[PDB]
Amino acid sequence: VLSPADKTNVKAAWGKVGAHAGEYGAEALERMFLSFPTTKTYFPHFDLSHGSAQVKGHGKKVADALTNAVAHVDDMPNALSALSDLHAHKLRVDPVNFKLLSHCLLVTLAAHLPAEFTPAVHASLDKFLASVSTVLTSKYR
Amino acid sequence: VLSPADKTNVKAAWGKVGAHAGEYGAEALERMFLSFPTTKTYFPHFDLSHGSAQVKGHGKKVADALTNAVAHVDDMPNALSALSDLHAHKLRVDPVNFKLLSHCLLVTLAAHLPAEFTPAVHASLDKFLASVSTVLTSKYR
Amino acid sequence: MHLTPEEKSAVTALWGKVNVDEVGGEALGRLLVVYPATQRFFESFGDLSTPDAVMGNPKVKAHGKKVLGAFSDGLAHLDNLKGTFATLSELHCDKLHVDPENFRLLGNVLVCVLAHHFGKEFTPPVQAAYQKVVAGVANALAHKYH
Amino acid sequence: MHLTPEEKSAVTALWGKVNVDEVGGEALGRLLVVYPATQRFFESFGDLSTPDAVMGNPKVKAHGKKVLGAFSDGLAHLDNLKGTFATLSELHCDKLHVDPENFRLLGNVLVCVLAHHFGKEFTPPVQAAYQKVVAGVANALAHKYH
Ligand code: HEM
Ligand code: HEM
Ligand code: HEM
């Protein structure tokens, strides 16, 4: 469960992301496909080459959904109900992959936000991405 | 989330387990220690030889807690609160291990309850152990 | 895949008693019932909406038989799982796009099915040897992913 | 360790620039803060109630240096991680009782720490090579568990 300080930490870090959300989302995807190639099995219809426009657009989408989760941190299951439904009933991504994307988003943030990525904020982001993942996989069965 | 049918299935299956719980608990443990040796790192103070009394005694306690969760299936997080605190603050067992014990309990039930371990019951039991594991692991950080 | 001779004997002994066709159908059907997400790969199989619809589906049964047939053949080559499953690995990756985590789920369901069928005879030491084999087969099928 | 020549070269050059004292202390501290459960092995280090207490704790800092030192030496034995870490694997299992899953957690924290320090230079391809090394190290440390 996210504590008050966690929420505060997440809102502040994500705040600094600002207009780079989309770029970071795309970067995290790229890091994931290269570091963890089994994740590519979910995207056979995508051009996965560096700088491809499908990865870019998808990067924006993920990033925006995350922004919405941060804005709705107290009410995630509701704010993300449709995405939760989509992942459970259509996409059907194995849960292990959410941990791989989460780690890659952390590495991306660590690389772009040096001053902001303190040990306490790192802790809070990791918990936040974990709750987001839990919400997106809650209706699987 | 458990569905009405899952609940019915779990009460039925556990009802056939009856006064064998303790014994099945100890068997699940031995299965776990032999198949997944890394799990032994959490029990260095135990005699882990076949038939060990510490293993029998601990099997009983695990089984009693599962019996209690079945009895309070509509209020598990509260019925297991004390156990959740113990695991989070003292024992601090990594969550992957819960999946390993759950699998071994399923194998144990399959080996002893051939007529009841139908596909539908197997599914409900797997969901049931996953909910129990989530509760025991929910206060870790 | 470090199997001891006595583990290898335990694995082979029991396997000689297995009806692969029937066990194959059960393991695949249970995978699809217990982990419904795995149904994403079988939309062409028809009705998979309830447990009886899955378990009795002739296409599930036939696919189960094919899967387990290849698995048996793997048990005849425990010293070279990787070479044995190389072309299947490539196929599952480049053509079928199957996330290898699914091979691990199937392995564990197969282990419950063996326990269900054999009861007592699937002792803790025998399960331990099978856990190593299912992990080795899952690793071999994942080895050509890129 | 299926490492590519360009991958081996990527790991080596970046590492030539790491201040092991700082990175070690930072990795171990972050591990204890991000995954509080890992504190179970470090009760004697003192106060770890807060992030500031952990990061400043001199024993945490010093244990971090020791851990990364051993890691550093492993990077010169990439063709033989198992043999290099064998004794340490035995000690982590037989004397310290450390669940190997913690090795994977430290690996990932380490990667986050490298990115945090090197920013731009820690590109997607460089991370991919480090993920392989950190998994290789974890696997070798877990190899002698029984
Ligand atoms: C933080 C976790 C994640 C979030 C917030 C997220 C969010 C989203 C969003 C916003 C969409 C687009 C839905 C639309 O078109 O309106 C989507 C689709 C998709 N996601 Fe997830 N996702 C996450 C993790 C994952 C992971 C781990 C995978 C698998 C590795 C995955 C695979 C997919 C796929 C294949 C699509 C459809 C892509 C397409 O065909 O365009 N996602 N997700
Ligand atoms: C189905 C999941 C589990 C349940 C229901 C469960 C339940 C319990 C219970 C009832 C106790 C006794 C606490 C007391 O004395 O009041 C206990 C203790 C303990 N459990 Fe858990 N447990 C589960 C999973 C695990 C797993 C996965 C591990 C790690 C492999 C583990 C490790 C321990 C340890 C080391 C103790 C202390 C044993 C001792 O020193 O006597 N448990 N658990
Ligand atoms: C023991 C592990 C497995 C083995 C040995 C195995 C083996 C096989 C074999 C021999 C085929 C037929 C190849 C061909 O058509 O040329 C096949 C096809 C297939 N397999 Fe696997 N399989 C395994 C696990 C799985 C898993 C767990 C899944 C997904 C959950 C899966 C998905 C598929 C699919 C979707 C096909 C194509 C079916 C079709 O004809 O439309 N397999 N496999």
Ligand code: HEM
């Ligand atoms: C990169 C992976 C790791 C490496 C290379 C490593 C290396 C080392 C080394 C070289 C020692 C000194 C042993 C001696 O004095 O002979 C040590 C001790 C120790 N390690 Fe590890 N370690 C790793 C990960 C971990 C993690 C993840 C844990 C638990 C979270 C852990 C727990 C310990 C403990 C409790 C000691 C004994 C410290 C003491 O004397 O109080 N290690 N480690």
